[PDB]
Design a binder for this molecule. Structure first.
Ligand SMILES: O[C@@H]1[C@@H](O)[C@H](O[C@@H]2CO[C@@H](O[C@@H]3CO[C@@H](O[C@@H]4CO[C@@H](O[C@@H]5CO[C@@H](O)[C@H](O)[C@H]5O)[C@H](O)[C@H]4O)[C@H](O)[C@H]3O)[C@H](O)[C@H]2O)OC[C@H]1O
Length: 126
């Protein structure tokens, strides 16, 4: 089924750059559209999957750690808890999906950051 993951503060969607499938590609915000690189499926294993086999993936547990796509493998850094307030928390890190520098424009990067009430850490949809 899928579903976009749209940033509240930016009104832009969680987007895989160029619809790349390459391990390590950092996530960005982009104007929402119908493509597969903006479709995210939540799984029972706690994942946010794109293209079927790729996972939203935290490269570390520290502030400013890159959020990237990576081949799904079962790691806890590929597990996320989408809260009731729209925060997306990394299970391994206890840090939140965060649009870097409170950025809102196309191309602003996504990272892990200390959970706050910033609108750059709030996301809607499935
Ligand atoms: O030297 C340092 C750099 O390494 C660092 O770069 C970042 C390192 O982290 C990168 O992201 C993580 C990469 O590792 C992933 O976990 C892997 C997934 O693959 C598993 O192996 C598979 C096992 O099954 C086999 O059949 C198959 O062949 C294998 O693929 C492996 O066991 C796991 O460890 C994590 O999910 C990622 O988070 C990140 O992209 C880099 O930027 O930067 C600092 C530098 O000093």
């Amino acid at each position: 089924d899928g579903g976009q993951i749209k940033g509240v503060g930016s009104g832009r969607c969680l987007d895989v750059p160029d619809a790349s499938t390459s391990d390590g590609t950092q996530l960005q915000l982009w104007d929402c559209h119908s493509g597969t690189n903006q479709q995210w499926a939540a799984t029972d294993a706690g994942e946010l999957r794109v293209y079927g086999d790729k996972c939203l993936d935290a490269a570390g547990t520290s502030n400013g750690s890159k959020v990237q796509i990576y081949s799904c493998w079962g790691g806890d850094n590929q597990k996320w808890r989408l809260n009731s307030d729209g925060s997306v928390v990394g299970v391994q890190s206890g840090l939140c999906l965060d649009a870097v520098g409170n950025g809102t424009a196309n191309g602003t990067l996504i990272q892990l950051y200390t959970c706050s009430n910033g609108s750059n850490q709030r996301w809607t949809r499935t």
